[PDB]
Design an enzyme around this catalytic site. Sequence first.
Site, PDB file in Angstrom:
ATOM      1  N   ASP A   1     122.654  21.371  17.651  1.00 49.38           N
ATOM      2  CA  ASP A   1     123.199  22.521  18.362  1.00 49.38           C
ATOM      3  C   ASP A   1     122.171  23.147  19.295  1.00 49.38           C
ATOM      4  O   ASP A   1     122.029  24.362  19.370  1.00 49.38           O
ATOM      5  CB  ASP A   1     123.744  23.561  17.386  1.00 49.38           C
ATOM      6  CG  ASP A   1     124.717  24.508  18.040  1.00 49.38           C
ATOM      7  OD1 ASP A   1     125.294  24.130  19.084  1.00 49.38           O
ATOM      8  OD2 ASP A   1     124.908  25.623  17.510  1.00 49.38           O
TER       9      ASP A   1
ATOM     10  N   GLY B   1     122.370  41.602  14.514  1.00 48.78           N
ATOM     11  CA  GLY B   1     123.545  40.791  14.767  1.00 48.78           C
ATOM     12  C   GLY B   1     124.326  40.496  13.504  1.00 48.78           C
ATOM     13  O   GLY B   1     123.808  40.635  12.387  1.00 48.78           O
TER      14      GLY B   1
ATOM     15  N   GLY C   1     126.989  36.645   7.049  1.00 52.57           N
ATOM     16  CA  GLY C   1     125.926  37.613   6.836  1.00 52.57           C
ATOM     17  C   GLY C   1     125.430  38.337   8.076  1.00 52.57           C
ATOM     18  O   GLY C   1     126.159  38.493   9.053  1.00 52.57           O
TER      19      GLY C   1
HETATM   20  C1  LIG Z   1     119.609  38.649  17.328  1.00 54.34           C
HETATM   21  C2  LIG Z   1     118.208  39.150  17.703  1.00 54.34           C
HETATM   22  N1  LIG Z   1     117.141  38.554  17.149  1.00 54.34           N
HETATM   23  C3  LIG Z   1     115.884  38.951  17.427  1.00 54.34           C
HETATM   24  N2  LIG Z   1     114.842  38.353  16.834  1.00 54.34           N
HETATM   25  C4  LIG Z   1     114.917  37.424  15.873  1.00 54.34           C
HETATM   26  N3  LIG Z   1     113.843  36.803  15.330  1.00 54.34           N
HETATM   27  C5  LIG Z   1     114.167  35.889  14.389  1.00 54.34           C
HETATM   28  C6  LIG Z   1     115.488  35.771  14.175  1.00 54.34           C
HETATM   29  C7  LIG Z   1     116.185  34.848  13.197  1.00 54.34           C
HETATM   30  O1  LIG Z   1     117.409  34.724  13.218  1.00 54.34           O
HETATM   31  N4  LIG Z   1     115.365  34.181  12.392  1.00 54.34           N
HETATM   32  C8  LIG Z   1     115.862  33.345  11.457  1.00 54.34           C
HETATM   33  C9  LIG Z   1     116.057  33.809  10.142  1.00 54.34           C
HETATM   34  C10 LIG Z   1     115.726  35.260   9.790  1.00 54.34           C
HETATM   35  C11 LIG Z   1     116.555  32.945   9.157  1.00 54.34           C
HETATM   36  C12 LIG Z   1     116.859  31.623   9.473  1.00 54.34           C
HETATM   37  C13 LIG Z   1     116.667  31.161  10.783  1.00 54.34           C
HETATM   38  C14 LIG Z   1     116.171  32.023  11.763  1.00 54.34           C
HETATM   39 CL1  LIG Z   1     115.941  31.451  13.381  1.00 54.34          CL
HETATM   40  S1  LIG Z   1     116.339  36.813  15.159  1.00 54.34           S
HETATM   41  C15 LIG Z   1     115.675  40.001  18.318  1.00 54.34           C
HETATM   42  C16 LIG Z   1     116.793  40.613  18.896  1.00 54.34           C
HETATM   43  N5  LIG Z   1     116.677  41.690  19.806  1.00 54.34           N
HETATM   44  C17 LIG Z   1     117.933  42.347  20.267  1.00 54.34           C
HETATM   45  C18 LIG Z   1     117.854  42.686  21.740  1.00 54.34           C
HETATM   46  N6  LIG Z   1     116.575  43.338  22.040  1.00 54.34           N
HETATM   47  C19 LIG Z   1     116.586  43.698  23.478  1.00 54.34           C
HETATM   48  C20 LIG Z   1     115.159  43.765  24.049  1.00 54.34           C
HETATM   49  O2  LIG Z   1     115.229  44.125  25.449  1.00 54.34           O
HETATM   50  C21 LIG Z   1     115.378  42.556  21.675  1.00 54.34           C
HETATM   51  C22 LIG Z   1     115.381  42.274  20.180  1.00 54.34           C
HETATM   52  N7  LIG Z   1     118.033  40.176  18.566  1.00 54.34           N
END
Ligand SMILES: Cc1nc(Nc2ncc(C(=O)Nc3c(C)cccc3Cl)s2)cc(N2CCN(CCO)CC2)n1
Length: 259
Positions: free
Chosen positions: A129, A17, A22
């Site tokens: 939020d 994403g 960033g």
């Molecule tokens: C946007 C997204 N994130 C996923 N997992 C994440 N884990 C932790 C995340 C996160 O941001 N950590 C974080 C960080 C790093 C810093 C500060 C604070 C935080 Cl909270 S994002 C999985 C995902 N997928 C896309 C779609 N797919 C379809 C399956 O059928 C599955 C997989 N997409």
Amino acid sequence: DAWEIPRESLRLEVKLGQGCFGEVWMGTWNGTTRVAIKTLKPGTMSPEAFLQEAQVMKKIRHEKLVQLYAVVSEEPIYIVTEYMSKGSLLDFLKGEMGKYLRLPQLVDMAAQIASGMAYVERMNYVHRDLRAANILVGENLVCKVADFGFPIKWTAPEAALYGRFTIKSDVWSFGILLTELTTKGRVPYPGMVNREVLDQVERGYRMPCPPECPESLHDLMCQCWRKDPEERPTFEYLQAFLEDYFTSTEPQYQPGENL
Ligand SMILES: Cc1nc(Nc2ncc(C(=O)Nc3c(C)cccc3Cl)s2)cc(N2CCN(CCO)CC2)n1
């Protein structure tokens, strides 16, 4: 710092994403650990600002809050956390899994959120939020609160009007989050724009009981949407109520076409 890691140990594999400040990747840390990585675009946000989220995530540790793993605090910056394999609860809810989820699965997702939020409650923190878009899902329907650093339809009146944000307005959002879980991802207050939501909600309006949603869960919603923030239930309450739901509240629960 103890949380520092060599730039070499981090591998960004899949781009997940983007934003103005960033990106978020799936990747590998120390060649073994599947992690999630979030970057800051040098020049867009101030390092001090983008690091205030990691500073916070440092004093936090709960199985229902996304966990910090490591940081690279010198530009370009990377924050590292555990990886949730299903994305936001909002994409999960309205995606392919949507159609198979029923009350038991959804009330259980809710419970965990309330469990994480109960921890936040205990630590005297405020989230600000709370909503489905900001819950991440994992294997086996594990739901964890995310993002620790305008959503009017999710925000309590006193917070949107007089900026009075609290765990009690967070509870409001939870109430709104319960409609998301029960409509499988549908935007709250359908066909209403921001301005009329403020007016109506200030004038006593509340969304009705979603289709096939037991009244007992609508009442729980309405308690979280009380005009006086102090009437609103605690998370430690909300947690217990949802864990005990199908025994103490809705023991005669039969599966329906959607819930
Ligand atoms: C946007 C997204 N994130 C996923 N997992 C994440 N884990 C932790 C995340 C996160 O941001 N950590 C974080 C960080 C790093 C810093 C500060 C604070 C935080 Cl909270 S994002 C999985 C995902 N997928 C896309 C779609 N797919 C379809 C399956 O059928 C599955 C997989 N997409």
